[PDB]
Design a protein around this nucleic acid. Structure first.
Ligand SMILES: Nc1nc2c(ncn2[C@@H]2O[C@H](COP(=O)(O)OP(O)(O)=S)[C@@H](O)[C@H]2O)c(=O)[nH]1
Ligand SMILES: [Mg+2]
Ligand SMILES: [Zn+2]
Ligand SMILES: [Zn+2]
Lengths: 113, 72, 929, 187, 185
RNA sequence: AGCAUGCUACGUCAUUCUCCACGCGAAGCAUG
RNA sequence: UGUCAUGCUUCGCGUGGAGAAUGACGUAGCAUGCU
RNA sequence: AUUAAAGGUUACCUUCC
């Protein structure tokens, strides 16, 4: 009886772009866990495949932090009956346990087919 | 008489070492073995037999000690 | 036998094997089964009695039983379908045991059944638990594992000490017969992880779900995701298994061509020293899905927590490469147009390749500092020396610097007959007397210097559990946060004795005083700044001692060079001077036993522990058998005080220097250069303090092992049951440091486990009710930890326990304790062994000391040490002090008699009358000063 | 600075006192003589101490100067000794095989542990028993480290020459082990 | 005391005693006290200079004593150890040690270490018939409070003398320094 | 009576000895 | 040949405080001189 | 760990959370 972690991931909206010149227009969602320190983003879900950088509004005076993203995967979601051919980027340097948490929670919430 | 032998062994090995017995590896090894076994002994007969052996080592060397004068 | 036969037939299935009717509704219930559990309620790695698992053994042709079992279990419909679904994706993998799903009728209901086929009796969690929680009197599982796989015969366990690494060194061979059976498991687990990733499955791998053939069979806690993106979580699988990979020498097949144990060894180029590619291949071959990044060379690591991680893997992988490729890296320079050979690097077995940053070719002239550095290192000493092949020892013999071998001998020791006669006339040394003579000067022959050096065969490469070590390191730095440290200049260094030897070759021209006054404060600063970006190897000289003791074995000491000491003092002395100036701390170095110091230390240890008991232990072969991962760790916590004065590169190069000239180095034993496998040197500037760190680390590890191996469902206290579920997370499920729990586990360990540490001596006051329930460490937990983490067996005859606190510790620093009334209040006083004091009086190490009149200060100190014996209930002990006082009086009278005839001087001023009165010695144990 | 003024002041004091003995009358003059004597003595006392202090300081400074000059004369000795040792050790090297092994290296760095193995011209073997002598150095020629060595000399723990014919199973108990055998590389 | 200043002070002190009589010697007590204190100051100045000399002399004498005794101890090291050894052996008064000591005093010293085993080789040197007659009877040999069985006897010049030949009649027929080999019984 | 000088007594600064608290050398003993 | 730290005892030289003695400057009481 | 663990009548309930 050794089971994946029980943490629950909270959803938030953010913007990301192909290059470091991130287009700060909401085009992505982020999954984060707020228990430790402040907020920590575990993964990003979007519709475009060209994303390679994502800029997060830092909780500090005039601070803008850009986090690099790994190559996307592909997922198919059904909130309504629709295509929802979305892509999941994992923040670079994310251990296996956090990936398991994100994937389990996402699979449970949206079937992912 | 256990302490007396355990001290006489120390004095005897000091006397042997002053007579330059260290120059023979075999004989010095035997002398050290005999000396270190009397000090750890708990019985008296064993200590006296090993004392006999060590004193025989000393008496083998003829001109080293003038036994007649020392025994006065 | 109607339904039973049908059930057996169905269990057999189409495989057509012959199954013994060993199973029923129940089966072999349990012998003992080790499980790694983690829920939202409980968590740990513990040994239980799992009741129900229908196990049928298979008999080979000729009606002979083999190690193959069919395990049938009853499953609810919901889990049956889930395991059937997840099994149909992984079925096409060689590393998955075959499963059979079938529904059978019991009492009118169709109950499902899952049957795993051809599983060994034990699992890989039983081997790890057996070797990590070792009890000498309970070895049934380990014995049966060793016998079943032809490691040894069952008559091998009738030997005296078949489990001791010191008494029976052949056991290291027996364990080595499990190496291939573990390497094959390491390969099959990588196969399984590849299958999981390809099929799109997420789950946690555990040790208890793999048998000893390497097959995986429990998919109840797995989930399913998109194919092509799976995630095997291997953090508690590899970490719990790491100490076993080095004990069974799993990676020995890598030394043979084509990784075949039947083919000859690999022939490596003799000039090769850079094995970065091989290390990367090994890591990618055996630890493919380990997440954290691995740096073959620790020069590129990011902090001290990243140096231990990679040094562990380097320790594992350095056993595959030839021994001649480790050591100083030599290069040819030109000075005055003349060629020298100098060291310009180092290939550490545990830190990789390091290259000096300041290599200057074509020099013109050498100053004092450069001459010192060039004469210190062993390059030109070994290059210009005869090849050596010493068959007396198994160590690596580098070279012979002379044409003759030197055989050093120790001498008997002088006899003080006057004191012996006086004591005998006073009634000592009679038959049946409690106090006798037990300390003597033992003599040694010429083969003593090398036979004592050959005890480094007890230092074996010990890979550690990294995820556990990275937490104990954090909990061990909270004991040293009340001090201050940093670098100091050459004008702030204090040297006690300047008439001491300066090592080799510097002992050929003067003492340590010649080099401290011949170098300016600007030269010493230049050398210290040089060592921060370069590696300087040195030579340590082994010498024999001439001192009283109670054992035959010769005692040797290691004198290190002058460069090492010079540069280490400026690095550590500021911190070392503060550890010895603090009162009331765990480490009691620098605290005296006089003027009520013993009482203060004991009362501090007792603290507010509830239901207290006292315990103490000892380390066999402490300096010889210390692994190289705990010495680096000890040196890494002492260097955490340098956050402001040094950068990361400077700290790494200081660590490299320490390792190169203390840990693994060249020793000059008898005029010949040998290589030192490891351990601790008895001349390093930080020996006592590093030993204290090692002691604290072992104690904390024992506590962590004690708390995590408890049931968890049987802990009554709510606070101590949430502290076990959170310790497992901080060890095996948190990657960063949880600063708020190392403060919570540190406090729990102070209210229930109070320590007093001095180098390798320790005294513990612990809660007796917790230890019985398995919430704090006992003497069995230490014996377990020292076995797999120290390659040493600690017998429960050199350890002590005390259930009454009014009698104090049984021993601490060779001193006993005694509660005595003093000035209307009771206090604890230390007293020695009377045999020690009498032997010091009777036997001396210099012919001049046998003249009493010349040495009256010699007996005042002995009387100071022997005073507390006056208050012992035994009356044969109390007489030693009075004997010493009377002998002092007699010596004074003789001295006054002699100096009146040879000269005509009647000593006018005499205050010696106070040295033969008890009022002078009693003030040494009164708390006024 | 102090001697002559003090002597003159005390001489004047004594001369003034002599008047009191000569006549004794006019006791007020006696009081003046006493006061002048006391003041002169006080001045001499004032002058007498700074001279001693300065002399002691000068002596200490001179001793310090002497000490500094004798701690820079032993520095030269040790420097010369170290230079001589390094140059002699260099002379003991073999510059033909060492150059070969160095030039066969990738970038010039080679491990230290192979230089004695591949460039040394002599071998020393220390043998504790006869079973080890039979398995390693048997005969007048043997092999080690991929080279052929010819036995040059054999001595015992007493530095006594032992002939190769005395080393036998029957004669082994009469030998003083260990035996040190020195051999010479064959070309 | 016994110093020229002391007496002076004493005299002044004596005058102060007279202060009791004659009403303080006609009230000259203040001048008397002043003079007394001045003389006492001079005496105190004198005393310390002798105290310092005494300390220096005592230290020098102690150092000389130390050096002489150390040299004496380190000079008679070989002569003073053998006497101690033989005094202790005499005090032990054991049967075995006394036997071998007496025999060695006569001249019958061993040639190796007396082996302490049931079957071992012991070689001894008999210098004269008398010692042979006393120790050697028949085929047995009494030595170190033990019985040894003779296996061979070799004359001063290598030969094999038979036990029959050794007799008073043939006493001058052999070079008498005689090596006797025996095995422990 | 007031002011100044001389003699005799009491409180503030420099030297001579006597006891306590801190640094540098030499010897010795114990512990890990 | 004779290592690293900690503690304690004894002796010898240097710095800071307290007691006694000797040197001049100021204030209080009494007496004498000029006025 | 078996239907994580223990208990009452593997269904339900109780107990740890
Ligand atoms: N540098 C130095 N260290 C010493 C010396 N003597 C002892 N130790 C240290 O003290 C511990 C063992 O203490 P202990 O004596 O109780 O065990 P043992 O094996 O002798 S029976 C080891 O870490 C030793 O390095 C010494 O002279 N120099
Ligand atoms: Mg399982
Ligand atoms: Zn790293
Ligand atoms: Zn620093």
């Amino acid at each position: 009886n050794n089971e994946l972690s029980p943490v629950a991931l909270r959803q938030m909206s953010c913007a990301a772009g192909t290059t470091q010149t991130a287009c700060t227009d909401d085009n992505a969602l982020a999954y984060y866990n707020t228990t430790k320190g402040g907020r920590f983003v575990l993964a990003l879900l979007s519709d475009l495949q060209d994303l390679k950088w994502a800029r997060f509004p830092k909780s500090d005076g005039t601070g803008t932090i850009y986090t690099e993203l790994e190559p996307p995967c592909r997922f198919v979601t059904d909130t309504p009956k629709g295509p929802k051919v979305k892509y999941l980027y994992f923040i670079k340097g994310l251990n296996n346990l956090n990936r398991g948490m994100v994937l389990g929670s996402l699979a449970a919430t949206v079937r992912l087919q | 008489k256990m302490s007396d032998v355990k001290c006489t062994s120390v004095v005897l090995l000091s006397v042997l070492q002053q007579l330059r017995v260290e120059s023979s590896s075999k004989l010095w090894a035997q002398c050290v073995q005999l000396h270190n076994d009397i000090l750890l002994a708990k019985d008296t007969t064993e200590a006296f037999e090993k004392m006999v052996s060590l004193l025989s080592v000393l008496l083998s060397m003829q001109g080293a000690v003038d036994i007649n004068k020392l025994c006065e | 036998s109607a339904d039973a036969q049908s059930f057996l037939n169905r269990v057999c299935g189409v495989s057509a094997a012959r199954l013994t009717p060993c199973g029923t509704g129940t089966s072999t219930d349990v012998v003992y089964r080790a499980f790694d559990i983690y829920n939202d309620k409980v968590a740990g790695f513990a040994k239980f009695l799992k009741t129900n698992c229908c196990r049928f053994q298979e008999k080979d042709e000729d009606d002979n039983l083999i190690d193959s079992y069919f395990v049938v279990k009853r499953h609810t419909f919901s889990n049956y379908q889930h395991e059937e679904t997840i099994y149909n994706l992984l079925k096409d993998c060689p590393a998955v045991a075959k499963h059979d799903f079938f529904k059978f009728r019991i009492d009118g209901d169709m109950v499902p059944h899952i049957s795993r086929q051809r599983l060994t009796k034990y699992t890989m969690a039983d081997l790890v638990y057996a070797l990590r929680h070792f009890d000498e009197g309970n070895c049934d599982t380990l014995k049966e594992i060793l016998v079943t796989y032809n490691c040894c015969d069952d008559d091998y366990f009738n030997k005296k000490d078949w489990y001791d690494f010191v008494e029976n060194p052949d056991i290291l061979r027996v364990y080595a017969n499990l190496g291939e059976r573990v390497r094959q498991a390491l390969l099959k687990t990588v196969q399984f992880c590849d299958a999981m990733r390809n099929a799109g499955i997420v789950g946690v791998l555990t040790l208890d779900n793999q048998d000893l053939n390497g097959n995986w069979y429990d998919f109840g806690d797995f989930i399913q995701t998109t194919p092509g993106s799976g995630v095997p979580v291997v953090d508690s699988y590899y970490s719990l298994l790491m100490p076993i990979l080095t004990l069974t020498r799993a990676l020995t097949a890598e030394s043979h061509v084509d990784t075949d144990l039947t083919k000859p060894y690999i022939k490596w180029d003799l000039l090769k020293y850079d094995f970065t590619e091989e290390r990367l291949k090994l890591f990618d071959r055996y630890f493919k899905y380990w997440d954290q990044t691995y740096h073959p060379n620790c020069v590129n690591c990011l902090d001290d927590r990243c140096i231990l991680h990679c040094a562990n893997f380097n320790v594992l992988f350095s056993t595959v490469f030839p021994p001649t490729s480790f050591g100083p890296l030599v290069r040819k320079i030109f000075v005055d147009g003349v060629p020298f050979v100098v060291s310009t690097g180092y290939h550490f077995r545990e830190l990789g390749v390091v290259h000096n940053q300041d290599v200057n070719l074509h020099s013109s002239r050498l100053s004092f500092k450069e001459l010192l550095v060039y004469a210190a290192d062993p390059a030109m000493h070994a290059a210009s020396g005869n090849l050596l092949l010493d068959k007396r020892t198994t160590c690596f013999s580098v070279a012979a610097l002379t044409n003759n071998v030197a055989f050093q001998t120790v001498k008997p020791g002088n006899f003080n007959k006057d004191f012996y006669d006086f004591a005998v006339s006073k009634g000592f040394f009679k038959e049946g007397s409690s106090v006798e003579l037990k300390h003597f000067f033992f003599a040694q022959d010429g083969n003593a210097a090398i036979s004592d050096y050959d005890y480094y065969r007890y230092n074996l490469p010990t890979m550690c559990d990294i995820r556990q070590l990275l937490f104990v390191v954090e909990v061990v730095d909270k004991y040293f946060d009340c001090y201050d440290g940093g670098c100091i200049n050459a004008n702030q260094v204090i040297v006690n004795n300047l008439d001491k030897s300066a090592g080799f070759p510097f002992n050929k021209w003067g003492k340590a005083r010649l080099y401290y006054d011949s170098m300016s404060y600007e030269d010493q600063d230049a050398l210290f700044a040089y060592t921060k970006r370069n590696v300087i190897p040195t030579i340590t000289q082994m010498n024999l001692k001439y001192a009283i003791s109670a054992k035959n074995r010769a005692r040797t000491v290691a004198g290190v060079s002058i460069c090492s000491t010079m540069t280490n003092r400026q690095f550590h002395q500021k911190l070392l001077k503060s550890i010895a100036a603090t009162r009331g701390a765990t480490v009691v170095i620098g605290t005296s036993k006089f003027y009520g110091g013993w009482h203060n230390m004991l009362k501090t240890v007792y603290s507010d522990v509830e239901n207290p008991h006292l315990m103490g232990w000892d380390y066999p072969k402490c300096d010889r058998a210390m692994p190289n991962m705990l010495r680096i760790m000890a040196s890494l916590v002492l260097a955490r005080k340098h956050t402001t004065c040094c950068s990361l590169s400077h700290r790494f190069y200081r660590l490299a220097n320490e390792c190169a000239q203390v840990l693994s180095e060249m020793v000059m034993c008898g005029g010949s250069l040998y290589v030192k496998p490891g351990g601790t040197s008895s001349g390093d500037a930080t020996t006592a303090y590093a030993n204290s760190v090692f002691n604290i680390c072992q104690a904390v590890t024992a506590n962590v092992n004690a708390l995590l191996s408890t049931d968890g469902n049987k802990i009554a206290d709510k606070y101590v049951r949430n502290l076990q579920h959170r310790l497992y997370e901080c060890l095996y499920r948190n990657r960063d440091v949880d600063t708020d729990f190392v403060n919570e586990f540190y406090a729990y360990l102070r209210k229930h486990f109070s320590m007093m540490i001095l180098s390798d001596d320790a005294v513990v006051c612990f809660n007796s009710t917790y230890a019985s329930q398995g919430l704090v460490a006992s003497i069995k937990n230490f014996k377990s930890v020292l076995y797999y983490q120290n390659n040493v067996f600690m017998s429960e005859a050199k350890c002590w326990t005390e259930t009454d606190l009014t009698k104090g510790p049984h021993e601490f620093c060779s001193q006993h304790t005694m509660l005595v009334k003093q000035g209307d209040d009771y206090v604890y006083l230390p007293y020695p062994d009377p045999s020690r004091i009498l032997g010091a009086g009777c036997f001396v190490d210099d012919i001049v000391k046998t003249d009493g009149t010349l040495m009256i200060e010699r007996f005042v100190s002995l009387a100071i040490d022997a005073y507390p014996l006056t208050k012992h209930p035994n009356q044969e002990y109390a007489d030693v002090f009075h004997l010493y006082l009377q002998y002092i009086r007699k010596l004074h009278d003789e001295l006054t008699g002699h100096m009146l005839d040879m000269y005509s001087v009647m000593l006018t001023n005499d205050n010696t009358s106070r040295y033969w009165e008890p009022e002078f010695y009693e003030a040494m144990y009164t708390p006024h000063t | 600075f102090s001697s002559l003024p003090s002597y003159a002041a005390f001489a004047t004091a004594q001369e003034a006192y002599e008047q009191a003995v000569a006549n004794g009358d006019s006791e007020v003059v006696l009081k003046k003589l006493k006061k002048s004597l006391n003041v002169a003595k006080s001045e001499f006392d004032r002058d007498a101490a700074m001279q001693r202090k300065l002399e002691k300081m000068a002596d200490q400074a001179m001793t310090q100067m002497y000490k500094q000059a004798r701690s820079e004369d032993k520095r030269a000795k040790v420097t010369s000794a170290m230079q001589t040792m390094l140059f002699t050790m260099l002379r003991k090297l073999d510059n033909d095989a060492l150059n070969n092994i160095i030039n066969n290296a990738r970038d010039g760095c080679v491990p230290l542990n192979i230089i004695p193995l591949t460039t040394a011209a002599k071998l020393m073997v220390v043998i504790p028993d006869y079973n080890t002598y039979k398995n390693t150095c048997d005969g007048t020629t043997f092999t080690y480290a991929s080279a052929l060595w010819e036995i040059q000399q054999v001595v015992d723990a007493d530095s006594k020459i032992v002939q190769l014919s005395e080393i036998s199973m029957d004669n082994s108990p009469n030998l003083a082990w260990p035996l040190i055998v020195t051999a010479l590389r064959a070309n």
